[PDB]
Ligand binder design. Structure first.
Ligand SMILES: [Cl-]
Ligand SMILES: [Cl-]
Ligand code: NA
Length: 129
């Protein structure tokens, strides 16, 4: 499923990302945009053999099991495919675990590179929340 920008902002809030660990909703929306273009089914192979999945491109090296990332962990205790669902519950929950891991959203390199330091409020501007 490919969400609309305001559609994704509302769902992320309903799912509690709003100011989670101090990250306002616009940070999350911004990250989702650049990681997956708002597409729950997005996947990309990393040069190390791991793969990123879903709207926030969560990695199989650490967070989910996809059965083909040797020596990896499954910290979110979920199969990576659950991160590709129209239902963003597993991606949201696993994202909360990641942002809580001590480096916050810097875990998302694309957030650090394209959102951090910018006016992220623009991502939820216009949206009824
Ligand atoms: Cl594996
Ligand atoms: Cl932080
Ligand atoms: Na894994």
């Amino acid at each position: 499923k490919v969400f609309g920008r305001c559609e994704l902002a509302a769902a992320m809030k309903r799912h509690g990302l709003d100011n989670y660990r101090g990250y306002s909703l616009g940070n999350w929306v911004c990250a989702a945009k650049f990681e997956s273009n708002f597409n729950t089914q997005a996947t990309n192979r990393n040069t190390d053999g791991s793969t990123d999945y879903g709207i926030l491109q969560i990695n199989s090296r650490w967070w989910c099991n996809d059965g083909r990332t040797p020596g990896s962990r499954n910290l979110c205790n979920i199969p990576c495919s659950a991160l590709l669902s129209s239902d963003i519950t597993a991606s949201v929950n696993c994202a909360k675990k990641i942002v809580s891991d001590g480096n916050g959203m810097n875990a998302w390199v694309a957030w650090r590179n394209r959102c951090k330091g910018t006016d992220v409020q623009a991502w939820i501007r216009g949206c009824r929340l």
